[PDB]
């Protein structure tokens, strides 16, 4: 069974993509969705078997690379971590598969589409089910190619093309550091099977832990978009929304998070990497939450929410608390999926518009869609007693529980990021739903008012909600975003939970903060985010639809104008990327291939030797005037010089220099 | 509406709005293949699933009926 949940998603995709001609659009959907659904059902069984009963299972099909000490197998290991990883991956992938049945009945190429999402599902199981780092890299690069293939799904979009390049190229930038890190693992241990790296890790050199740990830290940044390796994610949203839900909200961008958790037995023996895991997590936590506030696209705003929750995931990794990271991980996935899926039905309601400047009302038009997005946002903002409450809030107490300077320092950074989390959370809810209409008439012109004489049959299209296939995933995630947090709180968080007892997530007693997270923290700090959440929201409710003047006054001030533009344009980071990184590469290539290759390399080489040797030989041909007296004088001169060379006992260097001098005055014309 | 497109362009994934009249029996024909090699995988998986901790008989355990590493153990334990 355990090897079956690897094969099925692969099998649907090849029939969908290579025989999609012979199964048709609806057949491609039925095959792949069922394959995902079947894989979903067995995944939850493995969670009940691998984790609850504490039996990890090993599959070793055959060898992949076999060179001396290096025996990498196509082998698969299920343990407590990978069954937990496979729950959000498989629940959401199925729902997104159903969500796309409604989503893309108008898109022509609909069965190339359904194969990519089932090919994405296959490689995410490969990533998490591996025995070793190298096989993980197959699911690693495999989701990266699946993402490129989906970002540029509308490949006649030039925008999708540049976005696909950015996603593909940026993830390679991290994959270099990941690959170099695995070279350090192979060098210092002789293999990279997980059982072998972690058993030996408590004895290896400290400095090899940092060098290995650092390399996988950069690799985590590219997949899990961080403060530097993120430019690929916000414009990865050029793909269809089903893609962004499964891949760019909940699954692919936590690959780096999963790597940090999986490697916890290894990285736990060097506080340095955990220190950067902490500070980088808060810096990216606040860097992202600020950006989304000033975004005039619902897809691009909710994209930036993904990075912010991702940022808090890395923070807990640096907290040496991976159980919280996994708990928050899965919990963030469920509601965040709904947030994009809720937005997706919104985009279908309007004529595929994405700007907030022409969104409003829609309360009566999209009642169900509003209800779910509120449910998701409340768990996103960590409203108390929700799915996201236990997962998102516990972090801050865990951050504050570690009574160190860094822990308290990022508590402020996380909290101010949480403050801005509220701001865009209501901004999406307000502008789209709780505000005056800002689009054209057709978005809201119902049939209750006649307003038409001969066009009563058509022209209404007043932004109705979707059908069953579009709404069913919304309802399913809605239940999880309410209750799933409380049900599994002891499963992952607990206080002395023995769920992770097969050394799946290793934690060292020297930096335990679990007891301090619940006891030593003052009560005010425990409920402080709740105070800020309920408070800072009403100011936004006060600043819009109640006053709607202070925000305009702040905009047009010279100090306020630039702060809007600076944060809108993503801290000018891509500006500093395109001009001074990639345009630099494109000009070094220009210098090399013009000045050097088709340049000096040829001139100080074939073309130069060609040009001068032709001239040198025309000159020596010039002496061949075919007149007998000139020829006799040439013979007598050579007769003289051979006598000079011999009986004078000249050093041979003069003769060489005389010849070079003659050859190179023969080179000189006239 | 429907985007116009060439009718000569053979695609392996189908083309623009591809669906054959026989999208069902062909789907059934392919569906048997997926099932056929899935249990084929399940057989090999059930034969190579190696474990080290044995489950309690009381606990719910779906794999007690197909896997080998514990079915032999369970009947071996049924000897006293």
């Amino acid at each position: 069974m355990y090897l079956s949940i690897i094969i099925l998603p692969l099998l649907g995709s090849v029939v969908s993509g290579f025989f999609g001609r012979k199964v048709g659009v609806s057949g491609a959907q039925l095959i792949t969705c069922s394959s995902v659904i079947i894989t979903t059902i067995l995944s939850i069984i493995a969670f009940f078997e691998v984790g609850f009963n504490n039996i990890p299972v090993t599959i070793n099909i055959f060898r992949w690379i076999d060179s001396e000490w290096f025996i990498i197998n196509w082998g698969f290991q299920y343990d407590s971590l990978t069954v937990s990883m496979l729950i959000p991956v498989l629940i959401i992938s199925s729902l997104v598969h159903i969500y796309s049945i409604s989503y893309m009945s108008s898109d022509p190429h609909n069965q190339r589409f359904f194969s990519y999402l089932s090919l994405f599902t296959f490689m995410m199981i490969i990533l998490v089910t591996a025995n070793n780092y190298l096989l993980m890299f197959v699911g690693w690069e495999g989701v990266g190619v699946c993402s490129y293939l989906l970002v540029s799904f509308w490949f006649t979009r030039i925008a999708a093309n540049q976005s696909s390049i950015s996603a593909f190229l940026t993830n390679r930038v991290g994959d270099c550091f990941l690959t170099v890190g695995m070279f350090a693992i192979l060098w210092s241990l002789g293999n990279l099977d997980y059982a072998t790296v972690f058993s030996l890790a408590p004895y290896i050199n400290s400095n090899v832990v940092i060098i290995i740990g650092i390399c996988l830290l950069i690799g985590a940044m590219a997949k899990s978009s961080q403060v530097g390796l993120h430019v690929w994610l916000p414009m990865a949203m050029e793909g269809p929304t089903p893609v962004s839900a499964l891949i760019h909200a909940a699954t692919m961008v936590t690959a780096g998070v999963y790597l940090l958790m999986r490697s916890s037995p290894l990285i736990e023996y060097s506080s340095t990497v955990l220190l950067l895991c902490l500070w980088l997590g808060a810096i990216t936590t606040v860097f992202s939450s600020l950006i989304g506030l000033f975004q005039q696209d619902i897809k691009k705003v909710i994209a930036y929410s993904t990075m912010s929750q991702l940022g808090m995931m890395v923070l807990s990794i640096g907290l040496s608390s991976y159980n919280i990271a996994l708990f928050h991980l899965v919990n963030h996935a469920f509601y965040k999926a709904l947030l994009f899926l809720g937005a997706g039905s919104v985009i279908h309601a309007v004529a595929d518009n994405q700007d907030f400047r022409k969104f409003g009302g829609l309360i009566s038009y999209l009642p169900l869609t509003y209800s779910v997005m509120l449910i998701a946002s409340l768990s996103l903002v960590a409203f108390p007693f929700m799915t996201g409450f236990y997962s998102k809030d516990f972090i801050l107490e865990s951050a504050y529980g570690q009574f160190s300077f860094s822990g308290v320092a990022v508590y402020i950074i996380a909290t101010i990021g949480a403050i801005f989390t509220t701001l865009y959370s209501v901004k999406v809810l307000y502008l789209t739903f709780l505000s005056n209409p800002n689009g054209p008439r057709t978005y809201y012109r119902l049939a209750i008012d006649n307003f038409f004489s001969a066009q009563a049959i058509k022209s209404y299209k007043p932004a109705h909600e979707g059908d069953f296939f579009l709404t069913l995933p919304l309802v399913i995630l809605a239940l999880f975003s309410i209750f799933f947090g409380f049900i599994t709180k002891d499963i992952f968080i607990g206080l002395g939970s023995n769920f992770f007892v097969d050394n799946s997530l290793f934690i060292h007693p020297i930096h335990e903060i679990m007891i301090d997270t619940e006891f030593a923290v003052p009560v005010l700090f425990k409920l402080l985010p709740f105070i800020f959440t309920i408070s800072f929201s009403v100011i936004a409710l006060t600043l819009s639809e109640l006053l709607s003047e202070l925000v305009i006054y702040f905009k047009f001030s010279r100090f306020g104008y630039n702060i809007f533009g600076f944060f809108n344009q993503r801290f000018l980071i891509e500006f500093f990327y395109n001009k001074y990184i990639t345009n630099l590469i494109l000009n070094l290539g220009g210098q090399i291939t013009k000045i050097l290759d088709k340049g000096s390399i040829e001139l100080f080489g074939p073309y130069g030797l060609e040009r001068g040797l032709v001239k040198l030989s025309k000159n020596i041909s010039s002496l061949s005037t075919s007149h007998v007296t000139t020829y006799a004088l040439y013979i007598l001169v050579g007769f003289i010089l051979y006598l000079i060379y011999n009986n004078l006992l000249l050093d041979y260097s003069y003769l060489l220099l005389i010849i070079i001098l003659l050859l190179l005055l023969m080179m000189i014309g006239e | 509406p429907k985007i116009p497109y060439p009718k000569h362009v053979w695609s392996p994934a189908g083309g623009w709005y591809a669906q054959p009249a026989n999208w069902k029996q062909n789907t059934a024909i392919f569906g048997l293949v997926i099932f056929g090699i899935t249990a084929m995988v399940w057989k090999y998986s059930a034969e190579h699933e190696v474990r080290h901790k044995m489950p309690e008989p009381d606990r719910f355990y779906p794999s007690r009926y197909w896997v080998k590493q514990i079915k032999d153990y369970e009947r071996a334990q049924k000897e006293k």
Binding site: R21, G24, V25, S26 | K2, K7, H8, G14, G15, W16, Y17, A18, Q19, P20, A21
Partner: peptide, 6 residues
């Protein structure tokens, strides 16, 4: 609708 594959 769904066009016949060609």
């Amino acid at each position: 609708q769904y066009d016949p594959p060609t």
